[PDB]
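FAQ
Q: What does a multi-component entry look like?
A: The components come first, one per line:
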Amino acid sequence: TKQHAFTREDLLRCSRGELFGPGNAQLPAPNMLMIDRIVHISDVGGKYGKGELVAELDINPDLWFFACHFEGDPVMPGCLGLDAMWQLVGFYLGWQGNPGRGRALGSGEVKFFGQVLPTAKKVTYNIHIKRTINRSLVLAIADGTVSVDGREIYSAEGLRVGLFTSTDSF
Amino acid sequence: TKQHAFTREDLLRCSRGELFGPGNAQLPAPNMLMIDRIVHISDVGGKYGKGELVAELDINPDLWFFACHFEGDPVMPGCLGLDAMWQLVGFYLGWQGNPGRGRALGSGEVKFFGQVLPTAKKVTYNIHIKRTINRSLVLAIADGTVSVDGREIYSAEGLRVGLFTSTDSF
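Then the predicted structure of the entire assembly, as tokens:
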């Protein structure tokens, strides 16, 4: 929790289990990784005073999802922007020093009200940690937004991610 | 609204714009396509009497997402199972004969309470159309579940997809 920003290389290290250690939170590797960098992460501040993350994904026309989604009509899948938010909430839990593997548990409400085209430059994620619970399972609840070149386009309320150690199962 | 089941070849045709025609609903192509076949589609029946879809994805250990999500811990991304549901709701709107390009608009509550491992055989999607609205924009609201080998593992309430006869204002 000493470090407050992460490069792409740090995130790739995380995807190999080499940032938080084996059996702890892992980002997906490409092509499921939806984050290039984390520009801010903290356990204080944010909308609820319980922490926040700001992260970025650079957009270029050659990103793999543009070719297949959709043919003749390239647009970033909303589900992947949403997944970036789960990825970040999972990363937060690992970053705090909690053990166990990350699993997205769902969301309260998701809204898509804009799009990421291949001509965009940069997607930014803003995640506000609402609550962390440490009862039987460690979990985080958060709200998030996705913005493209300054403009808010997706929101999610009540994003939930849990950590599962060897003794707990799905 | 005449054909009630679709093969993978039909879905691939749909991803090329060749099922519903240019400018109308399109499934994503691989690797974003999350459906192998639609085993049932109808505009009557289902939980609300307004239609339903049953669709399937065959699972094998070589599906692309297993290698990157996660290294040493393969599991289907929940976001892609969720996307299968938006893909199916969009397909429903095209299948009804409505014009325009599909865009997922979001969801009410989403829950992940199980997982698809590479040792699973088959994922099944059950979608219940709740409402279709034709006032300003054509849209569908639906509930859905994802099951693996008989066992329910994901649910979504209030899935929303809209059709856009032009995407320039989204």
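Q: Is there any commentary attached?
A: Sometimes. For this entry: Chain A has one domain: 1-170.
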